[PDB]
Each structure stands twice: as C-alpha cells, then as structure tokens.
Amino acid sequence: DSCGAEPIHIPGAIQEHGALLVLSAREFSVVQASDNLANYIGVDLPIGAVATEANLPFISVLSAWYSGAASNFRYAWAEKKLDVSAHRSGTLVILEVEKAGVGESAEKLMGELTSLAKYLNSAPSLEDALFRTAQLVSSISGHDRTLIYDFGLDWSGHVVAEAGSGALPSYLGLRFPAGDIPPQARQLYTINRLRMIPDVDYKPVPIRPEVNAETGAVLDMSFSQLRSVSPVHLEYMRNMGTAASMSVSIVVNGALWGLIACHHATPHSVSLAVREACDFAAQLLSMRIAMEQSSQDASRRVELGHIQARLLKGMAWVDGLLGGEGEREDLLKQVGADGAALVLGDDYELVGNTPSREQVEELILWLGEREIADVFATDNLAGNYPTAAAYASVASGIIAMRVSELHGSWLIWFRPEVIKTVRWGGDPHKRIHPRKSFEIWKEQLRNTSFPWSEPELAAARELRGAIIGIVLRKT
Amino acid sequence: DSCGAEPIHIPGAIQEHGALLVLSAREFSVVQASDNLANYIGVDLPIGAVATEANLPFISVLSAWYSGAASNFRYAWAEKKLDVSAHRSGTLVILEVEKAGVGESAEKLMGELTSLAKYLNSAPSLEDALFRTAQLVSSISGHDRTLIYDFGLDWSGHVVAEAGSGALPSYLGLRFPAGDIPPQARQLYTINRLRMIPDVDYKPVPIRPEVNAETGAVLDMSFSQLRSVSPVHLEYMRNMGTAASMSVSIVVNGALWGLIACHHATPHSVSLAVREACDFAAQLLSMRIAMEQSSQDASRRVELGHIQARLLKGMAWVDGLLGGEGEREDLLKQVGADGAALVLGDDYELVGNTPSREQVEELILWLGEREIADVFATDNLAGNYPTAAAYASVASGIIAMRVSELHGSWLIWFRPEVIKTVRWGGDPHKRIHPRKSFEIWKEQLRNTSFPWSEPELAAARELRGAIIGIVLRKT
Ligand SMILES: *CCC1=C(C)C(=O)N=C1Cc1[nH]c(Cc2[nH]c(CC3=NC(=O)C(C=C)=C3C)c(C)c2CCC(=O)O)c(CCC(=O)O)c1C
Ligand SMILES: *CCC1=C(C)C(=O)N=C1Cc1[nH]c(Cc2[nH]c(CC3=NC(=O)C(C=C)=C3C)c(C)c2CCC(=O)O)c(CCC(=O)O)c1C
Ligand SMILES: [Mg+2]
Ligand SMILES: [Mg+2]
C-alpha cells in the first residue's frame, strides 16, 4: 500500500474544536502549542514559560496526576467551560482542551450503558449484541448513522449492524475494500481506540514550534484527540457525503476486530464523557465477542473430538475410515466435508460427493509439484488451479495432506460451491484518490466454499499424525 | 443440611428501610402491602383498590414498563424523596420503595467504575483484579470491610481479597465452612445477585394479607430487595459483630463463583444506584474470571497436547513411555506428576519418585476390589486408603487407570505431599446456631497434594485410550 506510507501520526496540526499544549515533565514548562491556544485558555504562553496556578488553575491536580500511575488526565475547567485532558509522551505531557459537554447527566450515560451491559452478560446471539451496541452509541452520540464494521482476514470490512436517523444512506450488509482504512491507520486504531472529526472542512491549526526543543523532533500525536486527519480521508468523507464522523475501535485478543463508525450529514461534536462512554460500549461488545468466539471454538473442538476418537480406535486400518456407513460419515464430518479421496498409491477410494477419479488424479499431480509441507487448505481451488472450475460444484474448497511421499499417498476432503452475491459499497478495484460513488456494487462470487475453521484444520492435521505412523509401522 | 430446608424466599415480611406493594398486572389492583406502606407513600391503599395517578404519580411510567420487555422498573420519586423499583412475579408486579440516594453524582460512580473497567480489560493478574474490584466497592459503598469470597468445590469459601477502614477484623486468607451459606441461600444468590441488611436488629414489617388473593399463595419474595432475612444469619451477624452487611453475587459460566461481602460495625444503607453500581463491578470481575479460566485452561491443554503428541508417536511400545530420559520426562509431565508406575501383569516399571514396589502392589489390590470405571483420581489417597499415609510424602495424590482388566495392567501417576496451614475463620466442625468465635483457627493439612486439573484428567483419559487398543491390538 502506497497510501500506507503517509505518516498520519505527525501532521504537526490539530482540528478547530480544541487547542493543544505540550509541557516538559520536569519543569511543567511550555515547549509547543497550537496557534489557537490563546483563543481557548484566554492566556498567551510563550515557549520556555513555566505553567503556574495563575496560568492554569488545575496545575496542582495535573502535577499530582503525572506523579501517579494513571495513563490519562481528565479535568472539568468550570470557569472557561472547557474539558481538559492529557497523556504522557516520553518526558512530555501533551495537554488538550475542548468545549465542555453542553448539558448531559452522567446517569443519562450510566443509565443507557447499564441497559446494554445487563443485556449482553446473559450471553445472547452476536448479531443482536452488535445491533444493541450500535443502537446505544446511536442514542448517546446522536449521529445520523451508527454501524459496526467487522474486519475480514484480507482486512476488507463487512457492515454487520446499523442504526440511523434516515438522513444518511443505509450500508448494512455492504462490503468495503481494505484500502478504505490503510495499514498504518489500522495499526494506530489498535492502540488509540477513539477518533472524532466534527467538521470535514475544518482549517488545520498549526502547532509551533514545528520542532520540539526537549526531543529535537516533531510531536508524536498518536494519542492526540485533536490530531489533524489525512487529507485523503477528508476527501473520502466529502465523497461519502459525511460532514462529521466518529469511530471507536473494537479490540479483541489484542487485534483490531472492527469499528463502531458514526457519520453525520452536517457538522456534529461529542463530549469527552460521551466519547469515553462509546469507547466503553466498544469494550463491553469486545469482552463478549472474545467469549462467544472462545466458547464456539471450544464446542467445535469437543464435537470434532468425539468424531476423531471413533476414527482413531476404528483404524486400531483404512476400514476404520471406509469400513461402513458409520465410519465414512465420521470421515466427512471430521472437517465438515461433503466428500473425501483416500489415494494410497494407485488405489483410489471416493467417499460422499467427490470429483471424478481422473480429476482427483490430476489434482494430486498439481499438489505433488508444489511445496506442500503438512496440509494444503483453500475455499477457492479454482484461484490457483483454474482446471478445477470444471468440478467447482463438488470441490470448490479442499484440505489436501500427503500420508506417504514415498508411496504418493493423499487424504483430500472436498467442499461444494456455495454461491453468494457480495454487496460492495462502491467499485472495489477502481497520489491515489477515493472513489466518488458508493452505490451497492454486486458481484456473484463463484467457485468458493464455506471457509475452513481452525478446529477443522487442527482435526485434519491430527488425523494426518495418526495415519502417518500407522503407514510408517505397516511399511 | 437441615438449615438448608428453611424457606428464606417466603418470610412474608420485609426490613424497616423500605415498603412493599403487590399489584395485579391486569387492573394494577392492590393485592398485598407491608404494614409500613402508608408511612412511606403517605397514602393508605385498601386491598382491592386500583392504583391511579392520584395514588401513584409514576403509574403511567409503570404501566408502560410492564407492557415492555425490561426485567426491572426503576423510578426516582422526587416529591417523596423515594427510589421506586419493581419486578414481575407471574401475573403480579412486586413494587418496592426506599429513601432516595442522599447526595451522590452519577459521574461519582461512573468515574470510579471506569477506573476498574479500564484496569481489567488489559487482562492482568486475577489477585490484583480481585483487590481492585474489592477496593472500588469499599469506596462507593463506604463499608468498614469489603472482601471477595471465592467458593471451593465443597462450597467452603476462602477470602482472596479485602479492603477495610480498620473498624472490623481482617479475614483475608481465612477459610469459612459451607454451612455459613447453606444450599437454598447459595441457589437464591445465583439468580438474585444483590442483598442488603442495613441494620441487624431491624423489626420485621409484616406483609398483609398473608395469602395473595390472585394466586391463593404466600408471596414469592425471591427478587424482593426488602425481603426479611433468616433469623439464624442475623444471629450469625451479631456474633461476627456486624450491625450492617451488603453482598453481591459473582456468577461465572452460570454458577455462583463467589461473593463481594461488605460488612459495617454500625447500621449503614446503600442507594439503589450504588447497589446497582456494585452488582455491575461484580459482573466486570465475573467477565474477567471467565476469560482467564478459559485462557489458562486453553494454554494448559496446548502444553499437555505437545507432550501427548511425543508419547503417542513414541509408542508407535512401552519404550515410547519408558525408552530414555526424554520419554520418561514426558510421561510424568503429561499430568504434572513426580512419579508413575506402569504395571503390566507381574512386570513393574517405576519412573521418577514412587512408593516401593510392594506399596504400589498393595495399592493395585485395593483399586481392583473397588468399582474403578475408567480412571480413579484423588489429591488425598490416605482419606480412603489409610495404609497410604506411610508413603504420603511420595504419593499423597494419584491418577490410577487400568489398561487391561484381563492382565491386571495399570498406569498410576504419583504426586508428593504439599503441606500447608489452613487458616479457618473460627472452628469449622463445632435447631442449629452459629459459632460465637471467629478467631483464626489453624489446622496442618497433611497427606494432600496439588489438585488434579481437568486438562490433566483429560490428558490422562486420552493416553489410556491410546494404550488400550495397542494392548488390544498386541493381544
Ligand atoms: C490513501 C487512500 C484512501 C482511499 C482510496 C480510502 O478509501 N481511504 C483512504 C485512506 C484513509 N482512510 C482513513 C481512515 C478511516 N477510514 C474509515 C472508513 C469507513 N468509514 C465508514 O463509515 C465506512 C463504511 C460505512 C468505511 C469503509 C474510517 C471510519 C476512518 C477513521 C476516521 C473516521 O472515523 O471517519 C485514513 C486515516 C485518517 C487519519 O486518521 O488521519 C486514511 C489515510
Ligand atoms: C442455619 C445455620 C447457619 C450457620 C451455622 C451459619 O454460619 N450460617 C447459617 C445460615 C445462613 N447464612 C445465610 C447468608 C449469608 N452468609 C454469609 C456468610 C459470610 N459473610 C461474610 O462476610 C463471611 C466471611 C468473611 C461469611 C462466611 C453472607 C454474606 C450471607 C448473605 C447476607 C449477607 O450479605 O450478610 C443465610 C440466608 C440469609 C437470608 O438471605 O435470609 C442463612 C439461612
Ligand atoms: Mg472478522
Ligand atoms: Mg472457586
């Protein structure tokens, strides 16, 4: 990705809806500031000046915070009607100010948050849990759209939940390309779980001096809430017809699972408290996704565990896999397959729904001349072996694993073609600029089967280990 | 348990710090009421009277709630300075009123709750997570003591965290008998996760009429917050020197994991909001306990999975288990054992630290004349086989499993004695009344090893399945 090279974490500028101040940990001395600082705190700070009580009324609370082991500082500056926040960046304190929450009770958030935390510890369906999470953020945020964006393995995303006022187009069930959120952006959103763009056509406020006197470097704005965004994304937002946006990162098992992406037809800001309330709903959803994944994976390994047990003691041999109706049923269910080919030399045994003997014969030749270490798995065989499109209907996906390289022996599982129409939020394929159109773009995905789960690949590799060793013993 | 027979869920009376009203779902008609109702709502309701706006200002909100699918009703009656709550009980609405929270911001709770939710999604150590949870409840509740009570397998409990003002004795690390919380109490606390006794010497307020006209039965007060407690527990609290108590249920994977038990030297009440804030911290802790248990169990099965793999292909045979230093090391590590006896007929093979050949010989005779189905496991062999105390130091715990009933073959793992002093909160063994003394009571637990984990028992049963079938093949 060429767009993945832009350093979005060091723009040296912020958005209009707040001001930024950089203090030296030791002296609490002014090192850098936004040109709009004076406008917000009604007090001009020269670079080198030491922050006193006169300057900042909260200086004694900030000093006590920094000495502490709390990651972030938050203070309600009642006098100026400002929300003050700060984080640690090496030997620096990056302090940010924004207009305070203009009327909103904590029990308004607390009360509406409990309704979801209580809902999704009973541990219901995910879809329903996703929607409930989206529907909450939608309420407290007040955005014209609040959708949940689940990342795929290729880092393309599929909209799995949606709440809206009706002012913005509905994207529920739409798929978006990986380039919409480039790698370095995905990496930043993994560690920094919040971001807000109240106005797409904000005029960036420079931070001066450009070079920080303490570090001799530009400011690391990775954890700056006011950080000026990448122009290419603003251009993207303008094309989507979104004047304002806010997104919360859903981080599960240390990885970026998805986003709670909120958009608005016209400029729209959210209070520090409400933003933290949304980051908190994202963590509740995150806590649940992990458990259901953990339990569904556990249930699957138990289910395949019962099947493996019957096969392993059935062999203790090929009639342990091929014996009668029961043995062959277990062979296919072992990895949730519809067919299997057990090829031991020139002896072919086809179970359930398989390609022709000749077609399977040609597949083993194609596999043999490729570096197939333990097992080869794909849910789209046609993608690498175009010839396989002829029997896509019976074997769109396979798990192939050799049991005796010397004898040219293989156990291959087959999965049939599962046809589905992929709704794309515009044309995927089409300095790089964002696409102007986001109209439902449909493609018929052919020659692709249901994906192979990790429990299934684990069960496959385990049966291979049992077969290999028997053949080793017999030979 | 004879104390486990008392029906604590139908006392037909409440505590003094609130009033209770029973309404018929259809008419919202008065069926039952506490004798102190008039005192609280300043309006006397005759049985048969229909609840109007004049009677209850919140009647239109309650009506809209009941029609809805929300489990519980909560309303802030500003006029009377009362917190109103209600739940569904068949065709009935059980409505309860108590004095409103006398000064406490939602951001006071919200702010102090986030500090723990943020702390324990980074997924640190449990002990630290337990203490952080206890230390929060201690702050918002304002109790003289806030401890976390982890239930054992025998339903005896061990204090694993503690926060206190110093006014009440410290019980951290103390163990309490199962009879302190009898079964029917444990069962109620599994479904009803909150309970509060602001004053131990409250005079129970009767509910009349005793018989509910709608059901022809006494009121099911399972989900009554004001429910009058069992006299034997109040007598228990008086002996502990606790005038007030509040406890939240920690429910993990559907089972009662433990309690957050709060006690106070003098009478002390907690607001509906703060009680719900504590029930909510208990769920945060609960969400975490489940994940660490889930991940620790996963990590263990992977670790033992690597060991099993080496043994299974090593046999493919007894030299697969007994071959050299590596094979024998894996045999012991398979279930985290220090010794093993592989007895195949009259042929004995002792690995690592085992009892004498004769001692193991006598153990197989004792096992043979007991209904040992698949495997027999214990962390205290002396408890059932007193003779085994002679070699408690080498084999305090064992996993024994026969591999050929016809040949009298066995694989037995040995774990050495791990001596520890069990601190008891009073004398465990000593109409039944509670013990008067809760002074640290010490016993030296001898002839007991580290407990056998489920992954270890699973790994044991799996190796048995591999050995059996080989011996079947060889024989
Ligand atoms: C460089 C080219 C590029 C193309 C072409 C493109 O489509 N996007 C980029 C770059 C890019 N994108 C972002 C950040 C970002 N993307 C999205 C995507 C999104 N929001 C939605 O609502 C939907 C679908 C419904 C999609 C697919 C979001 C949410 C964000 C984060 C900001 C926000 O919440 O709006 C960046 C990084 C911007 C920055 O942080 O500076 C870049 C460079
Ligand atoms: C019938 C005899 C009996 C003996 C003897 C005894 O010790 N307890 C009973 C009965 C019993 N206990 C309870 C409820 C209860 N027990 C505890 C225990 C406890 N609190 C602590 O702080 C510690 C240690 C530090 C222990 C071991 C708690 C917390 C509770 C719940 C109420 C509370 O929070 O105090 C009942 C049921 C009471 C009821 O709900 O009506 C009974 C019958
Ligand atoms: Mg995904
Ligand atoms: Mg326990």
CSV table of N, CA and C in Angstrom, one decimal, chain A residues 22-25 29 31-32 65-66 87-94 212 214-215 218-220:
chain,number,residue,atom,x,y,z
A,22,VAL,N,1.9,21.4,24.9
A,22,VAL,CA,3.0,20.4,25.2
A,22,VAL,C,3.8,21.0,26.4
A,23,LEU,N,3.9,20.2,27.5
A,23,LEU,CA,4.6,20.6,28.7
A,23,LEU,C,5.8,19.6,28.9
A,24,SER,N,6.9,20.1,29.4
A,24,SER,CA,8.1,19.3,29.9
A,24,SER,C,7.8,18.8,31.3
A,25,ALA,N,7.9,17.4,31.5
A,25,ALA,CA,7.5,16.7,32.7
A,25,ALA,C,8.2,17.4,33.9
A,29,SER,N,7.1,23.1,31.9
A,29,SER,CA,7.5,24.2,31.0
A,29,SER,C,6.9,24.1,29.6
A,31,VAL,N,6.7,24.0,25.8
A,31,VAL,CA,7.6,23.6,24.8
A,31,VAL,C,7.0,23.8,23.4
A,32,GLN,N,5.7,23.4,23.2
A,32,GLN,CA,4.9,23.6,22.0
A,32,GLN,C,3.5,24.0,22.3
A,65,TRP,N,-1.4,14.1,39.2
A,65,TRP,CA,-1.7,13.1,38.2
A,65,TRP,C,-0.4,12.5,37.6
A,66,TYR,N,0.5,13.3,37.0
A,66,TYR,CA,1.7,12.9,36.3
A,66,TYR,C,2.5,12.0,37.2
A,87,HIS,N,-2.1,13.2,28.3
A,87,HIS,CA,-1.5,11.9,28.3
A,87,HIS,C,0.1,12.1,28.3
A,88,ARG,N,0.8,11.0,28.6
A,88,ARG,CA,2.3,11.0,28.7
A,88,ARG,C,2.9,10.6,27.4
A,89,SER,N,3.8,11.4,26.8
A,89,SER,CA,4.6,11.1,25.6
A,89,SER,C,6.1,11.2,25.8
A,90,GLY,N,6.7,10.2,26.3
A,90,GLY,CA,8.1,10.2,26.7
A,90,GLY,C,8.3,11.0,28.0
A,91,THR,N,9.1,12.1,27.9
A,91,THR,CA,9.3,13.1,29.0
A,91,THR,C,8.3,14.3,28.9
A,92,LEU,N,7.4,14.2,28.0
A,92,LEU,CA,6.4,15.3,27.7
A,92,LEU,C,5.0,15.0,28.2
A,93,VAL,N,4.2,16.0,28.5
A,93,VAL,CA,2.8,16.0,28.8
A,93,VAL,C,2.1,16.7,27.7
A,94,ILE,N,1.4,16.0,26.8
A,94,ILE,CA,0.5,16.5,25.7
A,94,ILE,C,-0.9,16.8,26.3
A,212,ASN,N,10.1,20.2,18.5
A,212,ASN,CA,10.1,20.2,20.0
A,212,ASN,C,11.5,20.3,20.5
A,214,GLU,N,12.7,19.9,23.5
A,214,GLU,CA,13.1,18.8,24.5
A,214,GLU,C,13.6,17.6,23.8
A,215,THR,N,13.0,17.2,22.7
A,215,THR,CA,13.3,15.9,21.9
A,215,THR,C,14.1,16.2,20.7
A,218,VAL,N,9.7,16.4,15.8
A,218,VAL,CA,8.2,16.8,15.6
A,218,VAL,C,7.4,16.0,16.7
A,219,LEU,N,6.3,16.5,17.1
A,219,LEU,CA,5.4,15.9,18.1
A,219,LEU,C,4.8,14.6,17.7
A,220,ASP,N,4.9,13.5,18.4
A,220,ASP,CA,4.2,12.3,18.2
A,220,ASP,C,2.7,12.5,18.7
